[PDB]
């Protein structure tokens, strides 16, 4: 219910 395949989408999802 919360994690990351790689990084890119989850380094830029929040703002």
């Amino acid at each position: 219910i919360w994690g990351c395949s790689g990084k890119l989408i989850c380094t830029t999802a929040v703002p």
Partner: antibody, heavy 125, light 113 residues
Framework: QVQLVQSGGGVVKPGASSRLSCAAS????????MSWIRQAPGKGLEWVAY????????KYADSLQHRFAVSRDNANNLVFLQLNTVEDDDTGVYYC??????????????????WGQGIRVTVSS | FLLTQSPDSLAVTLGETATITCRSS????????????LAWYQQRPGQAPKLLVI???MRVSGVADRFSGSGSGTDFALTISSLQPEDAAVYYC?????????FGQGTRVEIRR
């Protein structure tokens, strides 16, 4: 460095089976979901399946009536796509692709940042 | 759940501006971040797609500033300013608002010289 190299494909008879392969290098393979996508004519890009980093869950498009099977080998850095009881709809270019995204309780939301070169499959007698 | 690109084909002159429309059947803007879950790809012939934009308007590393994303709700666009010969390709939009990702049918950019 970072790269996906595909093999397999070629001609296949209707109703028969074909196996596609993808070797990964240059990145931590066990950090990424992996997907397969095809490109037919008369309808362009089509996501077919993905596989998780590895608590192996797999998901498929429903239009493919359970006919395709995706598997993975973290060890040799390989992804496979098996096509079963192929039909005249399955002719096209098949890509594996590195799948980047986030997952929560509702599902996974992703994007394809690195693609293999592409393999052509031709359904023909 | 469809993504309809417009137009199918497009002839744009070198140094000028191309615009590629992507309409979604439904809204693709989530609440916990207020971003649209759309992406854009570029496919030069005999090559695999290359990702350019995520979150509808964010450029990815190693992508020129000529490629700009825009829009909200169900209506989005990719523009390409100061057109270059290497932009001659097919451009697809893709949503990731659900687990069932779908692509637009594609838009070809032909170049005038």
């Amino acid at each position: 460095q970072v790269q996906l190299v595909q093999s397999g494909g070629g001609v296949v008879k209707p109703g028969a089976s074909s196996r596609l392969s993808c070797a990964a290098s240059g990145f931590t393979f066990t950090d990424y979901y992996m997907s397969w996508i095809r490109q037919a004519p008369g309808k362009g890009l089509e996501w077919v399946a993905y596989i998780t980093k590895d608590g192996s869950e797999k998901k498929y498009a429903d239009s493919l009536q359970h006919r395709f099977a995706v598997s993975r080998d973290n060890a040799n850095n390989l992804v496979f796509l098996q096509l079963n009881t192929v039909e005249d709809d399955d002719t096209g270019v098949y890509y594996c692709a590195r799948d980047d995204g986030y997952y929560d309780r509702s599902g996974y939301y992703g994007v394809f940042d690195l693609w293999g070169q592409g393999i052509r499959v031709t359904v023909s007698s | 759940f469809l993504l309809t690109q417009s137009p199918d084909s497009l002839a744009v002159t070198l140094g000028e501006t191309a615009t590629i429309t992507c309409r979604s059947s439904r809204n693709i803007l989530h609440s916990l971040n207020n971003k649209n879950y759309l992406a854009w790809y570029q496919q030069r012939p005999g090559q695999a797609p290359k990702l350019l934009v995520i979150w509808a308007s964010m450029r990815v590393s190693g992508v020129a500033d000529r490629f700009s994303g825009s829009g909200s709700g169900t209506d989005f666009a990719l523009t390409i300013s100061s057109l270059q010969p290497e932009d001659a390709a097919v451009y697809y939009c893709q949503h990731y608002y659900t687990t069932h990702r779908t692509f637009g049918q594609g838009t070809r950019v032909e170049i005038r010289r």
